[PDB]
Write a protein that binds this DNA or RNA. Structure first.
Ligand SMILES: [Mg+2]
Ligand SMILES: [Mg+2]
Ligand SMILES: [Mg+2]
Ligand SMILES: [Mg+2]
Ligand SMILES: [Mg+2]
Ligand SMILES: [Mg+2]
Ligand SMILES: [Mg+2]
Ligand SMILES: [Mg+2]
Ligand SMILES: [Mg+2]
Ligand SMILES: [Mg+2]
Ligand SMILES: [Mg+2]
Ligand SMILES: [Mg+2]
Ligand SMILES: [Mg+2]
Ligand SMILES: [Mg+2]
Ligand SMILES: [Mg+2]
Ligand SMILES: [Mg+2]
Ligand SMILES: [Mg+2]
Ligand SMILES: [Mg+2]
Ligand SMILES: [Mg+2]
Ligand SMILES: [Mg+2]
Ligand SMILES: [Mg+2]
Ligand SMILES: [Mg+2]
Ligand SMILES: [Mg+2]
Ligand SMILES: [Mg+2]
Ligand SMILES: [Mg+2]
Ligand SMILES: [Mg+2]
Ligand SMILES: [Mg+2]
Ligand SMILES: [Mg+2]
Ligand SMILES: [Mg+2]
Ligand SMILES: [Mg+2]
Ligand SMILES: [Mg+2]
Ligand SMILES: [Mg+2]
Ligand SMILES: [Zn+2]
Lengths: 123, 69, 83, 23, 181
RNA sequence: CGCCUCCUAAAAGGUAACGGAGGCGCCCAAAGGUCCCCUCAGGCGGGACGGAAAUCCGCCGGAGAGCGCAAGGGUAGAAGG
RNA sequence: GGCGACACACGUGCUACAAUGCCCACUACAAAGCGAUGCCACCCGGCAACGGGGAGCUAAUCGCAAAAAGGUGGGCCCAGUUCGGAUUGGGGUCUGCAACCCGACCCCAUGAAGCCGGAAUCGCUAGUAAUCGCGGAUCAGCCAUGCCGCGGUGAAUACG
């Protein structure tokens, strides 16, 4: 487990590799490398352990990441449910939270179609 | 101990990123580690990292008491 | 969300009901049609009856729910499910 | 892609500007 | 025998403190480590890859001690288990090799644990022994991502001469066991 | 319809009925000889995946486990591993 | 308050599954329209949505304005990826009396299904189809991927 808790992929560039960490999008990648002064274009295989620890030390202390971030995200959702606002209610039943229609679609939140019998027609 | 089946434990030095150095015994002579006891947030004081937040919310919100009196 | 350049919004006609209460010694049930009002630190410990479109829903207010609107705690539709 | 707001092409599609598409 | 940092710490730092905390009248009354027992519950190797010498060799790397196999005591239909199948590895660490393993465990292994925030204060035997379970074996310094086929976890038994939970806790705490509460 | 086990069977043995209940017509090159070593089931507590039950640790636990297959007898001071 | 519901089912579409592609920088070539509590040059603050300033134009003059695919340079190297951009956490902006139900944006983080789609079925005969961007009407704002239009690039095939 190199950094933060994860092993970022060798043979790809640092700026891309950092993104594989939960909590680092491409934007935080560019800024971290700038702030610690490492080339964004250097393959992970080709970093001095000096570069490794410098990049490592920065990233973990600057932002909350991986598990801790997930936990903090979890506490937020948990809070909404417990109070419990309409937003919290939506998380209970696993419906969309941001005002999307549910007559159709919503498959990402609702999941696979549970097909059901319809209404029969006359003969 | 039984001959032939066990791996030799030798004097070994484990090195952390925080510059910590540990004198111990291992199957490997030298080992480099990302973290150790000496620098791990839970171990070191209470080095609360990025999260001082607790948590904050909700009525640290303030900003302000502007709605009139 | 509402631009913070502008002020945090409450209807005032509901806030004054609360503030008059704070003086005389609370509480009293408060009937309101202001779902659109923000929950405000002076409202904690009260119970405000938000009207969902059909009924006045009693809502007790605590610190953990300060930043929200009152209507957020009085859902407008009833579901239960299908079949 | 056009549905990616976090890109030039995406901001063009939505007809808006920002960090990812400046004016 | 040899000098190991954690062992010395037990004799000069931990032993006097324990007498202070509990007031033993006999030099043997005071808590000791008896043995540390490590177990890879396995059985993922019951039928498929019917032999995982890989787990043994990698366990051998960490402890310096080659584990012995444990075989099923009875056949169990639901676990797809025939009596006598090789379904575990166990190694018993005593004396120096116990100290050395505990030393690296406290110094580097536990810190490597994912989202680690201390051990469980409640995992005490009731009879003054302790157990903890690991889910990854790469947590140990002499095991790396490159050398591993699949993640294997383990069970660790630390056995003390202490009669009670209270005495054993102080020992493990004084030795450097980090507890969440 | 021959053979094994229990009861009937009246505290030696034996004892009948189209009396009450089961089992056998095999098996094992180790499941045989000997030497050496080892001790169960179960219960509570502890432990990643792991469950009522896999493997690990501790305490209690004289035999209630096991001994290829019915039943009975025997049996860990072993016939069990 | 609801018309915005959601175990489900259908139509019409949008965005894709990638290298004849994706990205960043740099550099070109349209047309038709719209515009006085309107379009807003340019300056500065903000990573930014925007905000404060602040000229010009009652407009073949001033502005919306950059057209985009393209062209040039470099990066990515076949990966559920620098493909895809749904979903969700957080923080902001603007219109508006007011964005809880139920607005559009911007930013950090998240990065789902999807590897070209069963039976079946649609459109188009040339500046057409495909593909690329632009404008308007409605309109405070906007759920427009809709509609009506405008140009850019530009095929394949018709035996019968
Ligand atoms: Mg990331
Ligand atoms: Mg809806
Ligand atoms: Mg030795
Ligand atoms: Mg007040
Ligand atoms: Mg993208
Ligand atoms: Mg003493
Ligand atoms: Mg306990
Ligand atoms: Mg003990
Ligand atoms: Mg390691
Ligand atoms: Mg008799
Ligand atoms: Mg006789
Ligand atoms: Mg036999
Ligand atoms: Mg023998
Ligand atoms: Mg148990
Ligand atoms: Mg497993
Ligand atoms: Mg028995
Ligand atoms: Mg039988
Ligand atoms: Mg309608
Ligand atoms: Mg559409
Ligand atoms: Mg208009
Ligand atoms: Mg994926
Ligand atoms: Mg998939
Ligand atoms: Mg991606
Ligand atoms: Mg949000
Ligand atoms: Mg709204
Ligand atoms: Mg492919
Ligand atoms: Mg395609
Ligand atoms: Mg025709
Ligand atoms: Mg396209
Ligand atoms: Mg348009
Ligand atoms: Mg409009
Ligand atoms: Mg919408
Ligand atoms: Zn360290």
């Amino acid at each position: 487990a190199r950094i933060a808790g994860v092993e970022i992929p060798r043979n790809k560039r640092v700026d891309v590799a950092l993104t594989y960490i939960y909590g680092i999008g491409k934007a935080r990648a560019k800024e971290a490398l700038e702030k610690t002064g490492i080339n964004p274009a250097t393959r992970v295989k080709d970093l001095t352990e000096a570069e490794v620890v410098r990049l490592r030390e920065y990233v973990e202390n600057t932002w909350k990441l991986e598990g801790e971030l997930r936990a903090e995200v979890a506490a937020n959702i948990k809070r909404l449910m417990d109070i419990g606002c309409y937003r919290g209610l939506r998380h209970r039943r696993g419906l969309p939270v941001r005002g999307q229609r549910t007559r159709t679609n919503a498959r990402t939140r609702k999941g696979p179609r549970k097909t059901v019998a319809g209404k029969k027609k006359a003969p | 101990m039984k001959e032939g089946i066990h791996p030799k434990l030798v004097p070994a030095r484990i090195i952390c990123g925080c510059g910590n150095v540990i004198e111990t015994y291992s199957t490997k002579p030298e080992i480099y580690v990302e973290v150790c006891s000496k620098c791990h947030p839970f171990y070191t004081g209470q080095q609360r990292f990025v999260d001082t937040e607790g948590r904050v919310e909700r009525f640290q919100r303030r900003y302000g008491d502007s709605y009139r009196k | 969300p509402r631009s913070l350049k502008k002020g945090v919004f409450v209807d005032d006609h509901l806030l004054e009901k609360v503030l008059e209460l704070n003086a005389k010694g609370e509480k009293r049930l408060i009937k309101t049609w202001s779902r659109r009002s923000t929950i405000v630190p002076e409202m904690v410990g009260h119970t405000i009856a938000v009207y969902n479109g059909k009924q006045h829903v009693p809502v007790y207010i605590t610190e953990n729910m300060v930043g929200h609107k009152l209507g957020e705690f009085a859902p407008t539709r009833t579901y239960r499910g299908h079949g | 892609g056009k549905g990616d707001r976090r890109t030039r092409r995406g901001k063009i599609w939505r007809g808006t500007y920002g960090k990812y598409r400046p004016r | 025998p040899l000098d190991v940092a954690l062992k010395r710490k037990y004799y000069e730092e931990v032993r006097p403190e324990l007498i202070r905390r509990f007031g033993y009248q006999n030099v043997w009354e005071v808590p000791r480590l008896e043995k540390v027992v490590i177990n890879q519950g396995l059985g993922e190797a019951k039928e498929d890859a019917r032999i995982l010498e890989k787990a043994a060799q990698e366990l051998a790397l960490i402890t310096g001690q080659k584990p012995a196999v444990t075989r099923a005591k009875k056949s169990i239909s639901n676990f797809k288990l025939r009596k006598g199948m090789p379904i575990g590895l166990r190694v018993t660490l005593r004396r120096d090799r116990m100290w050395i393993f505990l030393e690296k465990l406290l110094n580097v292994a536990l810190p490597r644990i994912r989202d680690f925030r201390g051990l469980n204060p409640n995992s005490f035997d009731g009879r003054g022994n302790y157990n903890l379970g690991l889910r990854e074996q790469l947590i140990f310094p002499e095991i790396t991502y490159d050398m591993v086929d699949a993640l294997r976890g383990m069970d660790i038994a630390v056995v003390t001469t202490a009669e009670t939970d209270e005495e054993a806790r102080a020992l493990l705490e004084l030795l450097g066991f980090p507890f969440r509460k």
